[PDB]
Structures are given as C-alpha cells and as structure tokens.
C-alpha cells in the first residue's frame with residue numbers, strides 16, 4: 001500500500017546535494033530503477049512523495065483544500081505580500097478575493113489593450129537599437145519591454161505620473177532578494193526582509209496621494225475611470241464591507257510580481273528556437289501569417305487570425321517549463337494509483353518530469369510545434385483542476401503581439417553554436433545568461 005522508497009547515505013541530509021546537481025537526471029534515474037511513477041524521497045529526514053505518471057494527474061489536482069492544503073507549503077511570500085493575505089487568510093475569505101482579481105482580467109476588457117502594446121514596444125525599439133548592425137543581450141531586453149508594456153495596459157494616466165515604469169521595476173527587485181534559497185522547511189523577517197519592509201511602505205504611501213486627487217475628479221462624474229484599481233475600490237465583501245488600503249496594495253503587487261519573470265523567459269526561449277538555421281522550415285510559415293495585416297493590429301486579427309503563432313508559444317513552455325514543481329500537504333490519507341499515502345506527508349507533482357515521459361511525447365528533447373500529446377491531460381503547464389492559473393489569456397495575447405511586431409522589421413542571428421542551455425541555479429528557471437548575446441539586422 002505504501003510507495004517505494006529511496007535509500008539515503010547520511011541521516012542528516014536527504015538527497016539535497018543531488019537536487020542541486022541537475023535534478024532532471026536524478027529524478028529520471030530513480031524512475032527507471034524502482035520502475036514506478038510514484039515514490040517517496042524523504043528529503044532531509046522529511047519524507048516527500050512524488051507523483052510522476054501522466055495517468056495519475058487527476059488524483060492530485062481534483063481534491064479539495066480541506067484534504068490538501070496549499071497554505072502551508074508556501075509560507076515566505078506570506079511575509080512578502082502583506083499580513084493576513086492569501087494563505088494568510090481563512091479559505092472562505094481567501095476564495096472570495098481571488099474572484100475580484102480574476103474579473104479584472106478577462107476577454108471582456110481586452111478591447112483597448114492591443115494598440116497600447118504596439119506603441120510601447122515601438123517607442124523602446126526605435127531608441128534602444130539605432131545602428132544598422134548591433135550587439136544586444138536578448139534576455140535583458142525582453143525584461144524591459146515586459147514591464148513597460150503591462151503598465152500601459154493596467155495603470156491610469158494619473159498613476160503613471162507619480163510612478164514611472166523604470167523606477168517601479170527596481171522596487172520589485174528589492175522584495176525578491178528577500179527570497180531565501182535552501183531555506184527548507186523548516187527554518188522570520190531578516191535584514192533582507194528589512195528592505196522588503198521599507199519597499200512596501202513607500203509603495204503604500206504613494207497610493208494614498210493618487211486617491212485624494214482622483215476622488216474629487218471621481219466626484220464630478222469623471223468620464224474616464226476604468227482603472228482596475230478603481231474596479232477594486234468598488235468591490236464589496238460578502239458580509240457587507242469594503243476593502244482596506246492594506247489589502248488593495250497587496251493585490252496590486254501580486255499581479256505585478258507574478259507576471260514579469262515568467263513571461264520574459266517564455267518570450268526569450270521563443271525567439272531563440274526561431275532564429276536558428278535548423279528551424280528555418282517553420283520561420284517561413286510564420287511570415288505566411290503576418291504579411292496580410294496592416295502596420296496597425298487590432299483585437300480581431302490577434303485573437304482569431306493567429307492560430308499557428310499560438311502553437312509555438314506552447315511547445316516552448318512544454319519543453320522548458322519555467323516552474324520546477326508544485327507541492328501540498330496531506331491533511332488526510334489519499335489513494336493514488338495502486339498505492340496510498342499516509343497523513344502528514346508532503347506530495348508533489350512535477351511538470352518537468354511529466355513533459356519528458358516517453359509515452360506521451362515520443363522525443364522529449366526535440367522541438368516540434370505540430371506535435372500532439374498521446375495521453376490526454378499530460379501537459380499541465382498552466383496547471384490544472386481546481387487551481388488553474390489566471391493570467392493565461394492575458395500573458396498569451398501580450399506575448400503574441402510582441403513576436404508579430406519584431407520580425408516584421410528586424411532579422412536576428414545567433415552567434416553561439418547551438419541553443420543555450422538551461423540554468424537550474426534560481427527558483428524560476430530560464431536559459432543561461434552568458435549565452436544570450438545576439439546580433440541584429442534591419443530590412444528595407
């Protein structure tokens with residue numbers, strides 16, 4: 001009934017060093033030996049059960065919060081967002097908040113986002129690269145465009161005056177450094193947390209000033225309105241109470257914190273694969289889809305007249321997933337396949353491992369946009385079941401618009417021998433930085 005177990009040498013540390021070493025091979029090794037998609041590591045004296053069989057994915061995403069709580073595994077962000085936030089609040093209360101945020105991001109509000117994106121990317125592009133031939137670092141250049149572009153989308157004219165794009169990105173960085181690597185459960189705000197403390201206060205203060213001047217204008221029936229934040233102001237709690245500054249501040253940061261890293265990486269990988277002598281066959285196929293539109297795109301042609309472009313962004317995520325793995329605690333015993341897991345254990349499901357199973361994908365390491373899964377429910381890049389990612393629709397529309405606006409004017413060329421390798425150092429994994437140098441050209 002119990003799952004198979006791996007044997008450790010030292011009692012003090014369980015397979016921690018092996019993790020630091022590339023874990024893709026490590027995890028594969030085990031699966032081939034114990035011949036099973038389910039086993040337990042027991043890391044650092046603390047058992048951890050991995051579910052790594054495409055067939056069993058539903059036994060893990062389908063179950064409710066009372067049986068499997070997410071609050072406990074992630075407890076460090078708690079410290080970052082605000083006090084008593086998500087995972088920082090009662091489930092009945094938390095569940096409520098997710099919904100207000102979700103409504104903000106919907107197809108019903110994408111109407112005016114497109115043309116705004118093109119402007120920002122063109123502004124930056126025409127000033128940052130000016131010579132006919134130049135050398136730039138892609139990974140560093142996709143990060144600037146992602147940040148400056150969202151704000152055009154979600155911040156009000158008056159809110160951008162008191163906060164520029166550049167400055168804001170710096171503010172987010174300080175909070176991140178608070179992240180502690182190797183801070184394994186279990187061990188508290190440290191000096192790096194002292195900076196994190198300051199950053200939010202400065203962000204909390206500036207919010208108040210924009211409100212006072214907006215209300216008088218909000219008074220008088222100001223015509224524009226439309227701010228997501230404004231939409232957030234109206235929100236009414238179920239019992240019958242309105243949101244406090246503290247919480248609003250928290251939600252906003254959340255939105256901004258989640259988007260930047262993941263989208264950037266996704267964009268970066270997509271341009272590399274696409275500029276290589278090998279992947280030439282599919283480079284034409286793209287031009288066969290972007291040489292009909294005018295110089296000014298509109299909502300329609302990007303949502304429904306760009307099907308294939310969407311097939312490229314997918315394969316990229318599938319092959320090199322930004323997020324290594326998701327986890328949760330077991331408040332009660334749960335059945336899995338032909339085995340069962342006791343109570344008080346830690347169970348995890350890995351996108352990285354699943355995307356490399358031979359049964360679902362014939363060749364895991366190859367890059368093909370026209371491939372299809374042989375087993376239904378294998379991919380799970382954007383998550384699944386009850387916990388499904390929200391920014392999905394938004395991130396895609398933004399990523400697609402960028403690709404479209406760049407290949408139309410510039411032609412890129414990679415200097416290195418072959419596509420860059422992954423770097424497992426950080427917690428959110430993207431391509432290695434020193435291999436990203438590229439040379440750009442210009443048509444016409």
Ligand code: HEM
Nearest residue numbers: 255258259262263326381382383387388389390391392395
């Ligand atoms: C490549 C882009 C993205 C990827 C790969 C991604 C991935 C994921 C994954 C794997 C989960 C579930 C993790 C778990 O089960 O604990 C998730 C959930 C979530 N994501 Fe994303 N996401 C992306 C974009 C975004 C964006 C743009 C936002 C906000 C603007 C966002 C906010 C959230 C939130 C609030 C959840 C809560 C999950 C829940 O409902 O329990 N994500 N995402």
Ligand SMILES: O=C(N[C@@H](Cn1ccnc1)c1ccccc1)c1ccc(-c2ccc(Cl)cc2)cc1
Nearest residue numbers: 086087094097098254255257258259262389428
């Ligand atoms: O950051 C988060 N998630 C991932 C990165 N990510 C990107 C897209 N999808 C996931 C992550 C990245 C790095 C470390 C851990 C997790 C995260 C952000 C916000 C909230 C949240 C929860 C409840 C409320 Cl009401 C509002 C917001 C939860 C999680």
